[PDB]
Amino acid sequence: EPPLVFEPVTLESLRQEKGFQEVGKKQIKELDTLREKHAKERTSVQKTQNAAIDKLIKGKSKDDIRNDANIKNSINDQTKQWTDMIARHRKEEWDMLRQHVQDSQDAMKALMLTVQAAQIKQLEDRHARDIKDLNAKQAKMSADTAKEVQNDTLKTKNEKDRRLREKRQNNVKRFMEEKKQIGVKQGRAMEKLKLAHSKQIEEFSTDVQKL
């Protein structure tokens, strides 16, 4: 029997024993299993992190867009409100203007009737002066005829008195014819006056009714 020879025990040879390698293998799995506790958590923690925020943003987005909805809902109300106000404000003008016109119309028509009447009275008032005036002239002659006879070449009152009686009555004829004429022109003047007023009314009425 050859003498025993013993391998040296080395870090290498010990390292390679399969019993000792079984220690390593156990250890790695223990670390795989640790990585398996971390990956689960790592992933799941990010899952909570993401889940909360992703819905957290949605909650805010729900209100945020809602707030926009409340401006359109308000402004759209606020704009019509303006339209309601202008529409009736627009009436206010139309309502008022109609009275302006009606009253302006009314006033013009009143103004007409007055002036028309003012002309009538101006004529009437004149017409009466003419007759007094005339009366005077007629009276003045009556003296003038009478005074002349007294200074006339008639020698005797018998003849003097006969001629004034002739003259006076002749003059009374003239006084009456004079009166007939002024009666007539005055009547003619008046009618023509009232006919102008009448037509003015007719034309004024047609002229307004147009507008």
Author numbering: 23 to 174, 176 to 234
What do the study's own words say?
At the inner surface of fly photoreceptor rhabdomeric membranes, the master scaffold protein INAD (encoded by inaD for inactivation no after potential D and contains 5 PDZ domains arranged in tandem) forms stoichiometric multi-molecular complexes with phospholipase Cβ (NORPA), Ca2+-permeable transient receptor potential (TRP) channel and eye-specific protein kinase C (eye-PKC). In this study, we show that the PDZ45 tandem of INAD functions as a supramodule binding to the entire C-terminal coiled-coil domain and PDZ-binding motif of NORPA (CC-PBM) with an unexpectedly high affinity. Our biochemical and structural studies demonstrate that INADL PDZ89 forms a supramodule and binds to the entire C-terminal coiled-coil domain of PLCβ4 in a manner that is strikingly similar to that of the INAD–NORPA complex. The striking similarity between the PDZ scaffold and PLCβ interactions at the molecular level might point to an evolutionarily conserved molecular adaption in PLCβ signaling in the animal kingdom.
Like the coiled-coil structure of mammalian PLCβ3, NORPA CC folds into an elongated three helix bundle structure with an N-terminal short helix coupling to the middle region of the helix bundle. The packing surface of NORPA CC-PBM crystals involves an extensive surface composed of α1–α4. We reasoned that this packing surface might overlap with the INAD PDZ45 binding surface, and therefore prevented the same surface from being used for crystal packing in the PDZ45–NORPA CC-PBM complex. We noted that the solvent-exposed face of the α2 helix is lined with eight Lys residues, which are all evolutionarily conserved and required for the membrane binding of NORPA CC (and see below for more details). The evolutionarily conserved, positively charged residues in the α2 helix of the NORPA CC are aligned on a flat and exposed surface of the domain.
